[PDB]
Structure 1
Amino acid sequence: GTSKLKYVLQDARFFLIKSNNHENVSLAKAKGVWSTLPVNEKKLNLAFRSARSVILIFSVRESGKFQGFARLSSESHHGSPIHWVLGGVFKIDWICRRELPFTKSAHLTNPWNEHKPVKIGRDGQEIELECGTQLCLLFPPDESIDLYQVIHKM
């Protein structure tokens, strides 16, 4: 079902994360971590303190798709070295590891990026609440993830 997902997304904040390659998203999916440039690190740390859930929605540049979305479980901290393909490290809990093609989100516009389609935005672009909620609900359900665990951290 979608009820626990909607609960996690209630009053959440949403950020578009762009990656240059699939390897970095695969690493983040396996290790439950993400790292970003300092200008975005500061914004995510501010948002983590401000909202019950902060959701990162990932897209690999030129893939034409989103690769999934996750929730921040920590502020950034400075751990084991991650061999990214090229600041601090955020811990993240994945909510959906399934893909969504850009074609399926063509009806969604982001008020915080001039009402451009939500697929459009620089790495770190915030997505307004309604658009972000609708985008996350478009993804295929990831039956391998139990959101009971995610709820306990809020």
Structure 2
Amino acid sequence: GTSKLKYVLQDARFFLIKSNNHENVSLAKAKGVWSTLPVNEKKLNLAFRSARSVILIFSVRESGKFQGFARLSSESHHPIHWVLMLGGVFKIDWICRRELPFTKSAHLTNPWNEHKPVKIGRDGQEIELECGTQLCLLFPPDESIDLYQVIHKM
């Protein structure tokens, strides 16, 4: 179903994460971690304290797709063999590891990026609540995920 997912996303904040390559997203999916440049690290740490859930939505540049989404479980902390100055490491719990093609989100506009389609945005761009909720609800359901343990972290 979608009910526990909607509960996790209630009053959440959402951020677009852009990566240059698939290897870094695969590592993030395997290890449950992400790292970003200081300008975005400071914004995510502020957001983590400010909201019940902070959601990162991932897209590999040139792939034409999102690769999934995850929820911050910590602020950053200060090794990971990323394919490239970076900040600390955020722990994340994956909510969906399935892909979503940009063609399926063409009806969603992000007010915080001039109402451009939600696929458009620099790494770290915040996605407004309604747009981000609907984007997450478009992903295929990931039946390998149990949101019970995520709910307990809130």
TM-score w.r.t. length of structure 2: 0.98
Query: Structure 2: how far apart are the matches of 1:70 and 1:54?
Result: 8
Q: Does 1:82 align with 2:80?
A: yes
Shift of 1:71: 0.0
Counterpart Cα distance in 2 of 1:103 and 1:63: 12
Show CA shifts across 1:17-55 (max 9, x none).
Answer: 000000000000000000000000000000000000000
Pairwise CA distance, 1:10:
0.1
> What are the ranges of 5 or more consecutive residues in structure 2 without an aligned counterpart?
none
Please state whether the residue corresponding to 2:75 is helix, strand or coil.
coil
CA shift, 1:87, in A, is 0.4
What is the SS of the residue equivalent to 1:43?
A: helix
Deviation at 1:117, TM superposition (A): 0.0
Q: CA RMSD in A?
A: 0.8
Q: CA deviation at 1:16?
A: 0.0
Render the CA deviation track for 1:61-105: whole Å, top value 9, x for unaligned.
000000000000000000xx1000090000000000000000000
Hey, what's the Cα distance between the residues in 2 that align with 1:145 and 1:30? 14
* TM superposition shift of 1:143: 0.1
| In 2: Cα distance, 1:149 partner to 1:88 partner | 24
Kindly tell me the number of residue pairs found equivalent between the two proteins. Answer: 152
Unaligned runs of 5+ in 1: none
1:148 is matched with 148
- 1:13 aligned partner: 13
Q: Secondary structure at the match of 2:119?
A: coil
